[PDB]
């Protein structure tokens, strides 16, 4: 009888850092993916299971909306099969992914004169994440053979790096906000 609150994730005021990406469960509602598609001019909105209009026919047990901020030249890594610091250390999709990846340029909101350093991403990790894993730990990463003793130092790195979103950044370095929709019956078209 009522719509899904997609504006609760898309039009949210703040976004998570990618290494601590938000998941919002979506359920018990009716979702029109065609109005979401035409809700704005997204720079990216790419589905891997079926298309928007096709989705208005299906029903799902649950839909999940993961959201976070990355820089422009990393938006290509939010796709099944990709590699890179983001796809491997921050947010990983299953190879057998049924859902949509939705992104738009966020430069006006998420950059700042002199730099916004609130948005972080994981630069170092000893092994790849599993699909849909989230790691928010902050151990010193031991890049070489000598101990770190829990502090930054020689070959010993804090594992998160900040973006420095400045409004004058090149487009590959500008912030982008991403929503990933997963479709695993409460949610129908």
């Amino acid at each position, epitope marked *: 009888t009522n719509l899904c609150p997609f504006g609760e994730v898309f039009n949210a005021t703040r976004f998570a850092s990618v290494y601590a990406w938000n998941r919002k469960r979506i359920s018990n509602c009716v979702a029109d993916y065609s109005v979401l598609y035409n809700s704005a001019s997204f720079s990216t909105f790419k589905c891997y299971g079926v298309s928007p209009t096709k989705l208005n026919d299906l029903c799902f047990t649950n839909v999940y909306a993961d959201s976070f901020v990355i820089r422009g030249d990393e938006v290509r890594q939010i796709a099944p099969g990709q590699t890179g610091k983001i796809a491997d250390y921050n947010y990983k999709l299953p190879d057998d992914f049924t859902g949509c990846v939705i992104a738009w340029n966020s430069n006006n909101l998420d950059s700042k004169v002199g730099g916004n350093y609130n948005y972080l991403y994981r630069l170092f990790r000893k092994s790849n994440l599993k699909p849909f894993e989230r790691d928010i730990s902050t151990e010193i990463y031991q890049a070489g053979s000598t101990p770190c003793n829990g502090v930054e130092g020689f*070959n010993c790195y804090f594992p998160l790096q900040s973006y420095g979103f400045q409004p004058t950044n090149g487009v590959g370095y500008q912030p982008y906000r991403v929503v990933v929709l997963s479709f695993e019956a409460t949610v129908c078209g």
Partner: antibody
Amino acid sequence: VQLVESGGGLVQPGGSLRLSCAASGVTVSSNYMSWVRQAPGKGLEWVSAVYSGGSTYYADSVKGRFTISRHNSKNTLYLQMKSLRPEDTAIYYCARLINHYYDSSGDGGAFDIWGQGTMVTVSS
Amino acid sequence: LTQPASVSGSPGQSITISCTGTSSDVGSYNLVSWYQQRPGKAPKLILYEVTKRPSGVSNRFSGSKSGNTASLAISGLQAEDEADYYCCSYAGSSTWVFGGGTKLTVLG
């Protein structure tokens, strides 16, 4: 290619001095850096190092008195000295300290790019 | 770190230059480096990670480690090798320690 130092001079005991190490052809903010000093007629002495995340380390003979830092907008490393003693008189070199990612095989751990040096004399 | 103050060799001969630290220095890590210094000039790296040579350093220069003592060996000794030589080692916890220096003379 190059690290160009400046800022050395004559200062009285208990005075202060800021050395600068302007880089060219390497990015300071992407490198471990160090200051190494050499008293006249003596050997090299490691003084200070800066690593990732702004972490900094110092020789015991220098803690509480020197501070290493950098300005990325100027691609320049600095050594800020206070409470200078006569035994701080030396040529001060800055150098790049290679690390694990230099070749991603071994740990590195050596100074391969060296400044010209700049002379610091602490005398009354 | 402890180095001999002086070392002598005739042209074409082979020398060795030792560098003795502690179980905390040379003994605990494979991070020994060596430096050549000429009067009025900055040090030049010639060995790191005990045994590796930078691009451009002649393989007349070689390095080794045994216990708490590293060694620098120079073969085919040339006049241009007359200089000061310094070993250096990781000293734990992101610190570094140099040897006192060795003055190499090429007897002429």
